[PDB]
From Swiss-Prot, chains A, B:
Superkingdom of the organism of origin: Eukaryota
Subunit and interaction comment: Muscle myosin is a hexameric protein that consists of 2 heavy chain subunits (MHC), 2 alkali light chain subunits (MLC) and 2 regulatory light chain subunits (MLC-2).
Localization per record: Cytoplasm, Myofibril
Family classification: Belongs to the TRAFAC class myosin-kinesin ATPase superfamily. Myosin family.
Known role: Muscle contraction.
Annotated source species: Gallus gallus
The protein's name in its UniProt record: Myosin-11
Domain topic, free-text comment: The rodlike tail sequence is highly repetitive, showing cycles of a 28-residue repeat pattern composed of 4 heptapeptides, characteristic for alpha-helical coiled coils.
Lineage, broadest ranks: Eukaryota, Metazoa, Chordata, Craniata, Vertebrata
Residues of the full protein shown: 1595 to 1623 of 1979
Length: 29, 29
């Protein structure tokens, strides 16, 4: 269960990666 | 506690998205 939630943590870290690229797109304008 | 750190990270996520939404609303140009 801990390993599964760690993989979920990595997936959500990826989600903040899309958050970062969204912020970069916002700053581009 | 690990998942609550994840939850506060998600709180940062949603606050950033709300800030992006209001920023786009106010300065869509």
């Amino acid at each position: 269960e801990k390993r599964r939630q760690l993989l979920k943590q990595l997936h959500e870290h990826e989600t903040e990666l899309e958050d970062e690229r969204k912020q970069r797109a916002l700053a581009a304008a």
